Amino acid sequence: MKILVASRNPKKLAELSRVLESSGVELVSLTDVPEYEEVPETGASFEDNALIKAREGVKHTGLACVADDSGLAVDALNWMPGVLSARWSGRHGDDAANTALLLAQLSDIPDERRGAAFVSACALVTPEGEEVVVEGRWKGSIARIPAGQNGFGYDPIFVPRGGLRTAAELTHRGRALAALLPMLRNLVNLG
Amino acid sequence: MKILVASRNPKKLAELSRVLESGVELVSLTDVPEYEEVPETGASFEDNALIKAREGVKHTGLACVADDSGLAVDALNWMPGVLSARWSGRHGDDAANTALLLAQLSDIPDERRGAAFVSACALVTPEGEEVVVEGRWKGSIARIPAGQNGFGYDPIFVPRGGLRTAAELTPEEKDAVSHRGRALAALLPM
Amino acid sequence: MKILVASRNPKKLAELSRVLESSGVSGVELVSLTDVPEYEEVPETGASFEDNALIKAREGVKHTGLACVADDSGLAVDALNWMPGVLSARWSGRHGDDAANTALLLAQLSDIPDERRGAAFVSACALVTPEGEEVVVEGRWKGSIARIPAGQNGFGYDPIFVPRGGLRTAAELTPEEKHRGRALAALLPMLRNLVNLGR
Amino acid sequence: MKILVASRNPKKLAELSRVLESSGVSGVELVSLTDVPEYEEVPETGASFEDNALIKAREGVKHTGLACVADDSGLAVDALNWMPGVLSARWSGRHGDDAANTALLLAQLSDIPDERRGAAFVSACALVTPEGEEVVVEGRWKGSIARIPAGQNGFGYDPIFVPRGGLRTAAELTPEEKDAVSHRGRALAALLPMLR
């Protein structure tokens, strides 16, 4: 079966192809079908926005469509930057400017109120109109100064819960996560 | 390695073991000293799964998975939420919970009857790392119950993409919905 | 000038008249929903008294061309994600059985510890002008839900609503309460003036 | 009886004092923060002007034992999940830089179609009594965010706030017009049935 991946980034398809083995699915990207207008995204709901993108994919191709939506949710900003994460400073794709704005907005906020999460949502919409959306949230808080060089986006200022290091400072924990992650997808049982 | 499943339901632990088919021993709450389970409020299945998983770690030092599931109805500001099982005031009275929901929505037109079945799962590590995932099956609330192959709100939940209720779906129809839900859960870039 | 009040209760229009006389406004006759042709009233859902008051006022303007004031009141309970909300009066599923609404709420919350029993009585008022201006105001009286009803001088959820600042329910307050009056009588107008939208 | 106005702005007491004369409330003395010992003001987060006004009023009572009125106002934009919220005056990271706050908002909202640019000016006010009774009110003036600034008869976000019912921004409104919007807001606040 052909499934439309509502992305032009082959990195999404490559990971999705290898993850679908864990059975006859052929994945196609937006670069394989005629271009269509992409509705701009607003608000804090990664889930709603992943569903909107996935609905549009089905609408234009008649194929089942998976779409994703990811970003940063900050309690003190009412869970924004939200789906404006990549353009929070007003400038799309400028990671340093997005981070600089966030730090300045939060510059007086004590650590106890700097809670935040990295969020990633994935939606599936079928030709028959079934809708399912999933999301994952990695809990943490916003640092006061950026640290670390092994990360993109907000990694230099996102401190995962459970430590003091930022995500960009990250290189026993692997074996614990690698075995625990499957159970998180298993206890999900919508039917 | 021991992983605590924050549940006293032995069928849940057995099913979770069947998904592990790696040197991992799953332990339940009944295998560890009893502790008081704080009652749940609000609409956030994610927050409540995390609370239960944190509590498991706090009492055992083990990594802990917890789940939290129910029905979220747009017209009730995403309640019944974590009160889904006791919405009528009486825990486990599925028929009364359903009858209450219908009565609360009795004059609401189809366009505003949107709802979702939600299932959230949380992981907390001994070191305090926290991850929560949730799945949402989008649909709407029927006006009358239909079907006999379901529990809870299944007789009045109409999945988007059809007119039949969840309780009217065959077992084959129900597995195809849970296979795609778990397939999305594995795709999450995070 | 005529203003539509989106109500069938003459007492509501009487109070608005008394506020326009104590506000120093003249030449304003209020008309009710029985003074204009009947129109379909869309049922209310959700937790937002403000949004729902605005929906009702827009509809009033739509059918009459008059400025329209509408109101929307009820109970917001933290543990119910701020429901009963605009379903407060029919929380048990049937409008007008206050006793059943109150019993359902208590039963729904029966295991919730005091610290998480927070709630508020909310009252929202919206104005939409013929030109399409929209203003909405709300007031919230903070409190919590009792575990058992008490008091006999109240309707609706009053026997199970505990105002913050005491242990008594709204139904337990004496008419002389409504020393506390003089503090409220001076403070209430100050909340009204400081709502300064036009800046 | 003394009532604390949780403000250091003398204009706030005068406006409230004039309202105690129009009510006819006797024997009430208004006090400002400049008349009581200084205490730490906790920074504000989120979108709830109501919650933040209550936090400020509670703090006043805690430090003085007086009934306390406090206010909190700003801009709520649908597309930013009702932010800038209580960060309205420092939305760009710099308090009081209206040009920077407004330009950032415009930049954040570029390419957002008119139907989704909804917004509101919000003004909330809280009362907390010595006994711990809590009442909070808010008013919302509905509108949307312009694409380019216009008008000079306003500060802050006035040049890019388009009130519902017209195409002009708040900064393009005359003083006669801006007077009538606070009059209707305060008249609605007095009409609120629960205020009974």
Side-chain angles (χ1 to χ4, degrees), chain A residues 3-7 10 13-14 17 20-25 27-36 39-148 150-169 171 173-174 176-179 181-182 184 188 190-191, chain B residues 1-14 16-17 19-20 22-24 26-35 38-147 150 152-171 173-174 176-178 180-190, chain C residues 1-17 19-20 22-24 26-93 95-151 153-154 156-175 177 180-181 183-186 188-191 193 195-198, chain D residues 1-10 13-14 16-17 19-20 22-24 26-39 42-154 156-175 177-183 185-190 192-194:
Chain A
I3 294 185
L4 175 67
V5 177
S7 179
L13 289 82
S17 327
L20 292 184
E21 310 275 318
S22 298
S23 61
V25 184
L27 304 183
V28 303
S29 81
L30 290 176
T31 68
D32 306 305
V33 299
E35 209 175 281
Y36 56 85
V39 178
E41 302 185 30
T42 57
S45 178
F46 303 95
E47 291 186 358
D48 289 345
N49 276 280
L51 275 168
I52 287 171
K53 266 137 60 165
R55 290 183 189 116
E56 282 294 297
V58 179
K59 167 178 165 177
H60 283 96
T61 72
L63 304 172
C65 179
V66 178
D68 50 46
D69 211 287
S70 296
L72 180 68
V74 179
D75 300 9
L77 302 182
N78 209 37
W79 288 281
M80 303 302 285
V83 307
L84 278 74
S85 285
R87 62 204 208 263
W88 189 238
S89 61
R91 299 146 56 181
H92 192 261
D94 191 335
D95 296 339
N98 294 342
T99 291
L101 175 59
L102 181 58
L103 292 186
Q105 289 175 323
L106 304 182
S107 66
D108 300 307
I109 305 318
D111 289 337
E112 311 82 54
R113 306 168 50 197
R114 303 178 73 85
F118 271 147
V119 183
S120 177
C122 282
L124 166 72
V125 178
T126 70
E128 301 78 9
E130 176 178 280
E131 305 187 352
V132 178
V133 62
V134 182
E135 85 175 356
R137 294 191 180 240
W138 190 22
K139 300 296 221 136
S141 60
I142 306 305
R144 294 197 174 261
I145 63 175
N150 284 109
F152 58 111
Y154 296 98
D155 288 352
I157 61 170
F158 183 74
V159 179
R161 217 99 274 191
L164 302 178
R165 293 176 293 165
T166 71
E169 284 178 305
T171 69
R173 177 187 169 262
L177 283 179
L181 292 184
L184 287 211
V188 162
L190 296 161
Chain B
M1 163 181 194
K2 288 189 178 175
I3 295 183
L4 174 68
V5 179
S7 178
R8 294 187 194 78
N9 178 343
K11 315 261 176 157
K12 188 167 297 173
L13 180 88
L16 270 163
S17 288
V19 188
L20 293 184
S22 298
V24 173
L26 301 180
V27 54
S28 81
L29 290 175
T30 73
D31 308 305
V32 299
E34 205 176 355
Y35 59 84
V38 178
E40 303 184 31
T41 57
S44 178
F45 302 97
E46 291 187 357
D47 289 348
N48 275 280
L50 273 167
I51 287 169
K52 269 137 60 164
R54 292 185 191 115
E55 280 293 297
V57 180
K58 167 177 164 178
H59 285 95
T60 71
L62 305 172
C64 176
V65 298
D67 52 44
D68 210 282
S69 300
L71 182 69
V73 179
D74 297 7
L76 301 181
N77 211 36
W78 289 280
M79 302 303 286
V82 310
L83 274 71
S84 287
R86 66 173 289 105
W87 190 238
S88 64
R90 293 186 298 286
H91 197 270
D93 192 343
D94 294 341
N97 294 342
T98 294
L100 175 58
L101 180 54
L102 290 184
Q104 288 177 322
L105 303 185
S106 67
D107 294 306
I108 303 316
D110 289 333
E111 309 82 52
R112 306 166 50 199
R113 303 179 73 83
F117 272 135
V118 183
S119 177
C121 306
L123 165 72
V124 178
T125 70
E127 302 79 6
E129 179 166 44
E130 306 185 353
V131 179
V132 64
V133 308
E134 86 173 355
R136 294 193 177 245
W137 189 20
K138 304 297 289 232
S140 61
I141 303 306
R143 299 195 179 262
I144 64 175
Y153 298 96
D154 284 353
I156 61 168
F157 180 74
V158 179
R160 208 154 284 181
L163 302 178
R164 291 170 47 238
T165 70
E168 285 179 306
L169 304 181
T170 67
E173 283 181 316
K174 288 180 175 201
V177 171
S178 275
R180 302 197 278 281
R182 298 175 198 181
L184 282 178
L187 293 164
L188 292 181
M190 184 278 323
Chain C
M1 150 178 291
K2 288 190 204 158
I3 295 182
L4 173 67
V5 179
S7 179
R8 300 177 165 79
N9 183 350
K11 274 300 164 283
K12 205 136 245 192
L13 285 78
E15 289 328 284
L16 181 63
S17 289
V19 163
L20 292 185
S22 298
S23 174
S26 60
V28 175
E29 42 199 31
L30 307 182
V31 309
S32 79
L33 290 172
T34 66
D35 303 304
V36 299
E38 205 176 39
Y39 56 83
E40 166 185 286
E41 284 151 36
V42 178
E44 300 184 29
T45 57
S48 177
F49 304 97
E50 291 187 0
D51 290 344
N52 275 279
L54 274 169
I55 289 170
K56 269 138 59 162
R58 293 184 192 115
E59 280 293 298
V61 180
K62 168 177 165 126
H63 288 99
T64 71
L66 305 173
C68 176
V69 171
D71 49 47
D72 209 283
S73 306
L75 181 68
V77 181
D78 300 10
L80 304 183
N81 210 36
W82 288 282
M83 303 303 284
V86 306
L87 280 72
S88 285
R90 60 188 201 281
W91 189 237
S92 62
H95 195 262
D97 190 339
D98 293 341
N101 296 343
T102 285
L104 172 60
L105 183 56
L106 288 185
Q108 287 177 321
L109 304 182
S110 69
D111 298 309
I112 305 319
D114 285 334
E115 309 82 52
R116 304 164 48 197
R117 302 181 71 83
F121 274 136
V122 182
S123 180
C125 278
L127 166 72
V128 178
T129 68
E131 301 79 9
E133 174 176 294
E134 305 184 351
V135 179
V136 61
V137 179
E138 85 174 356
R140 295 192 177 242
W141 188 20
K142 302 300 219 104
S144 59
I145 304 307
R147 299 196 179 262
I148 60 175
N153 356 288
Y157 298 101
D158 288 353
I160 60 169
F161 181 74
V162 180
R164 223 159 280 170
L167 302 178
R168 292 176 292 157
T169 71
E172 282 178 306
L173 299 187
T174 66
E177 251 131 18
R180 172 174 175 264
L184 286 180
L188 291 182
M190 299 177 73
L191 295 208
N193 188 83
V195 167
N196 189 1
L197 293 163
Chain D
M1 121 185 275
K2 296 183 175 229
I3 296 182
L4 173 68
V5 176
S7 178
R8 278 181 140 88
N9 179 16
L13 286 81
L16 291 176
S17 172
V19 154
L20 291 182
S22 85
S23 86
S26 297
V28 176
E29 157 185 356
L30 302 183
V31 160
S32 79
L33 288 172
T34 68
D35 303 305
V36 298
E38 208 174 22
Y39 56 83
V42 179
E44 300 183 29
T45 56
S48 175
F49 303 97
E50 291 187 359
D51 290 347
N52 276 279
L54 276 167
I55 288 167
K56 272 139 59 163
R58 292 185 190 116
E59 278 292 297
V61 180
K62 166 177 164 176
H63 286 98
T64 74
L66 305 173
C68 177
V69 179
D71 53 46
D72 209 284
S73 64
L75 180 70
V77 180
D78 296 11
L80 304 183
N81 212 37
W82 287 282
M83 302 303 284
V86 306
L87 279 75
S88 284
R90 64 196 198 275
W91 191 235
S92 63
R94 181 163 293 165
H95 190 262
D97 190 337
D98 295 342
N101 297 343
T102 64
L104 173 58
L105 182 58
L106 291 185
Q108 289 175 321
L109 303 184
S110 67
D111 303 307
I112 300 315
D114 289 333
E115 310 81 52
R116 304 165 50 199
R117 303 178 72 82
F121 275 148
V122 184
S123 177
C125 305
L127 165 75
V128 179
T129 69
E131 301 78 10
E133 177 167 77
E134 305 185 351
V135 179
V136 64
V137 308
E138 84 173 356
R140 295 191 177 243
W141 185 22
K142 300 301 222 103
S144 60
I145 304 305
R147 300 195 181 262
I148 67 175
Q152 54 74 49
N153 179 38
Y157 297 95
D158 287 358
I160 59 167
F161 181 74
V162 180
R164 226 90 264 198
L167 304 180
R168 293 178 294 162
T169 70
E172 286 179 306
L173 301 181
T174 69
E177 290 166 313
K178 299 199 93 185
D179 197 6
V181 170
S182 280
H183 283 170
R186 295 165 170 164
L188 283 179
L192 290 183
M194 177 274 289

